[PDB]
Amino acid sequence: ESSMYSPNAQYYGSLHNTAHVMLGRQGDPHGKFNLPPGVMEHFETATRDPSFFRLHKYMDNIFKKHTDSFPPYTHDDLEFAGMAVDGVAIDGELITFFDEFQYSLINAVDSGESIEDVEINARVHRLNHKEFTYKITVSNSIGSDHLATFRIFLCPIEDNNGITLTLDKERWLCIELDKFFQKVPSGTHTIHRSSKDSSVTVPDMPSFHSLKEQADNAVNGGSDLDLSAYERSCGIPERMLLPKSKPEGMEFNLFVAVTDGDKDTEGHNGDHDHGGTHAQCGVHGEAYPDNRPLGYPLERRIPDERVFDGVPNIKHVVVKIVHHP
Amino acid sequence: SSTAHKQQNINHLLDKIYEDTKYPDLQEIAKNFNPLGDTSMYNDQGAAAEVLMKELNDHRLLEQHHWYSLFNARQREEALMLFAVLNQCKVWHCFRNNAAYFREQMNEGEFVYALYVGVIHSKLGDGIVLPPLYEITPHMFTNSEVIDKAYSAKMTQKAGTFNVSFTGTKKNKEQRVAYFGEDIGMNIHHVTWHMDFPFWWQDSYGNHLDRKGELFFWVHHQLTARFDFERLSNWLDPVDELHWDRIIREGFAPLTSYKYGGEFPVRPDNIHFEDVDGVAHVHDMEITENRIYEAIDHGYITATDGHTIDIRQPKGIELLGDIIE
């Protein structure tokens, strides 16, 4: 990155953070023109720049050399014995669209002495999607109810040239849609999971005006303000859960791995509140709740797809996403 | 064997160095002295004299009237063979007689080098003042135009004093600071520092050169900083650093010649480094540079058997000078 956890910054330096500055300053690399830092030199702005994603794919490939160095998972590594994913379906069509969102610009302008504010807003078009629900039918033949981790990914079927991808060529392209822990009772049952409840996403932030109104209303009148209804600001926006897709529709693989929740949460508390964004943003003030490597079970090479196909607790199905312009 | 006689002996040995000696006593010694005749005059009982005499008798030494470079490995080895003999002499008559004998047998550039470092590094040399090399070998300090006027003055048998101008033209901004690197005394400072602190020194020659590797850093740091102060004085920016993968912006025409060997070569402006046959590939320089920086950023130098030598300590800079020179 590097962080202050680095055991040897004198030798390994700070590749990623220095790269942000190297890239950000390429419009004036010698300071001759006195230009200010580039968009890459703030986390507020870095993703606006196309080169952000070229830099971060470069960095991602460094990590991938390490993750690719481990032996592929075996059947015995992956099997959650007695747990079979019988079916994966979605209740509701997968549909994206653009809608409009407003935020205040008042703090950007200069207010005089004794000059009344006027409302000044920006309106942006933003991606969004319709609500849907996963229906994951699972057969538990273990003999007792068991905690399971449900890991949900969206994977490309073909590339932009129309070439069908192998699982090994898909896995590093898959995007995480959800991760959750749920007790699966003995027998056959359908788990339902709302798109709204994804542990990858958080809702749009409340506006500054709304926070002022709610705080002021609570303070005025001796009313206990409680905002325990809102989430953290870390997390993919809920509205961006799905890729845009195409008006003609595109098909993707919806990949579901159901894994041993006891093993995954050992040393923690599996059936406890982990907040709404633990997949990539963790749990405020607590240990990370999932012991598996990030990306499990897609983070190692899969040279032989037969291994995955032979594991009853892994299943993928084809889903279609349609963009409404 | 007194200082007056030793100084006179050195004066005579260095006089008209491109011709056979004109002093009857030195001619007699060169004719009749046997470097192997009485090994009791050496601290090594003649070992070094045997090595040099064998090379001489096998016709393996560089001819007289030929360019000499201390950076040429074999020519340096030959000069150091004579240094080794002089350095083993217990008394002055050994030093003088061997110098006179090999003056008439060995290349003049090798001989002058060996005699200077022999005087400097032998206690027998104490109290001797070496003549300035710009009067012993003026070609190495005097542009070709002035030497030609000297050659003309000699061809015509007429005395004269001839003005030396700096190299280049007024269109060449680098000429503004030619008075620094072309100063004959600055050149003597530089050659003499390396004669005092030679990279070929081994303590088997008799003593240790204290802190040599750190003094190597320091003397060149001061040359660099002093040159930049002249640039600043002449409305020039500081020098850039060289890099093996970038052009050397500033070329150079010395307008100087060897006494034997021809004109010194010129370098055009704005050239990329090319591999030099028999020396190194440009890529080898980059690798060597990388390895040195690896030691610096590790905080240790790696020994031949792989064990670490800590440089996070006051002698680290000295060890770096040892490995960098």
Ligand SMILES: *[C@@H]1O[C@H](CO)[C@@H](O)[C@H](O)[C@H]1NC(C)=O
């Ligand atoms: C050489 O320089 C001296 C003084 O530096 C001057 O008197 C003389 O005119 C110069 N000679 C020529 C040929 O320019």
Ligand SMILES: [Cl-]
């Ligand atoms: Cl059911």
Ligand SMILES: [Cu+2]
């Ligand atoms: Cu980054």
Ligand SMILES: [Cu+2]
């Ligand atoms: Cu030097």
Ligand SMILES: [Mg+2]
């Ligand atoms: Mg030759």
Ligand SMILES: [O]
């Ligand atoms: O980033």
Ligand SMILES: [O]
């Ligand atoms: O980052």
